[PDB]
Amino acid sequence: GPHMATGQDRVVALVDMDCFFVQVEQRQNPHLRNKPCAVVQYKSWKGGGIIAVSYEARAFGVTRSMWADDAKKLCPDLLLAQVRESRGKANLTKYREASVEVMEIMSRFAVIERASIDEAYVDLTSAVQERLQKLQGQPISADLLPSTYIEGLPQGPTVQKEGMRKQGLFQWLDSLQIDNLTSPDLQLTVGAVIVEEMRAAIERETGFQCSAGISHNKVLAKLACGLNKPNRQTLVSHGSVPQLFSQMPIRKIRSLGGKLGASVIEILGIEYMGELTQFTESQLQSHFGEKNGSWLYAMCRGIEHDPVKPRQLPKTIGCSKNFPGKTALATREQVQWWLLQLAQELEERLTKDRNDNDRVATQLVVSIRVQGDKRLSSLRRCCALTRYDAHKMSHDAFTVIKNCNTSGIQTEWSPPLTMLFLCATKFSAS
DNA sequence: ATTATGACGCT
DNA sequence: AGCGTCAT
Ligand SMILES: Nc1ncnc2c1ncn2[C@H]1C[C@H](O)[C@@H](COP(=O)(O)OP(=O)(O)OP(=O)(O)O)O1
């Protein structure tokens, strides 16, 4: 009752760029705009591997992970843009720089947590309070929410998509109590107004479109964001949760898309997030551990407390390359040459980072995969990163992994290496 | 023969 | 520390 938390204390948004690498390439090359297209890395093996796909191309069944030669079978007119190659490897700088463009715009509106290259969480609680003060009891017009969906609406006693969106929005606004500044539904609505403004600024100033979710916590904002893509935003209210979760597969909720989620389904014999409400907190803790159990108990009721962390920059800067099948590195010279290539890219990125962001990395992490090992990484070792110098970093990395070589012949490397990875970590202010 | 990333939890 | 999970 009066002491039961409802997790309605914050307004949190998640902004997620639409088909991001594709939009970066379409801005640069107008011939790719409004076309079925995809971004690919490398070209020699089966036309290259697809890593991003325009919505026009998705309509043909083109997906990430597909080889371009195969995507062409589904969509013969598919256009392609290739990721830059430097030092023998894919180089993602263009997309990292475009990400900074968007993150810097978002930061004007609120504190953001950079979740990935094209996603950021926004804590809008304070911005909403401020805006509510300006409004002064003034109602919110549907015109302020031109791309907003209200999940769950319309409901109760038009056959077109936009028509449905407006119908739901009208029902929501009709029911709002703008008289109460502490109303969580009103707070979410003002949050959505601000996110429309943020999304308009992103598009005006970069050309890029995005989707967004607005709710009371990160997990619901992330879920909301995916409900109406692309180029739309979705508000998930606390009250929408029981219906939304009643048919929502467990794997759709962030963090439950893997083994833990599979175990929840198997152990409890349930399919949907809402079904979790029938277990006590202690029951859930018994199966999934103290932390997970408490998290699940609250989450299935729409409640989550993970904060939006004030962090706009990545905490690590890494470079990696796979050497699949027959290309696995089998000589010491090979291993050394590629460590140098990786280290040269890393040096370039670190030097720019130090100049831009007033920080220096102090730890170098080296990871490798050996042929035969099913795991993505077979071994990881660290050493001090004391100088931004590619020859030094590559020599140091060789030193920490050189004893992994089984070969009795110094010149040969066995078992062959199928992945090299260098990562700079442990930043300190500079 | 997906590949190239990145954050965070466990022990 | 080094490994594993989950995710863009
Ligand atoms: N598995 C991956 N391997 C390499 N790059 C990836 C991978 N997943 C995502 N990316 C890159 C390319 C994407 O354009 C970018 C953002 O990813 P993501 O948000 O999952 O999809 P997207 O932005 O391409 O489409 P959507 O419109 O569905 O969000 O990150």
Ligand SMILES: [Ca+2]
């Ligand atoms: Ca995206």
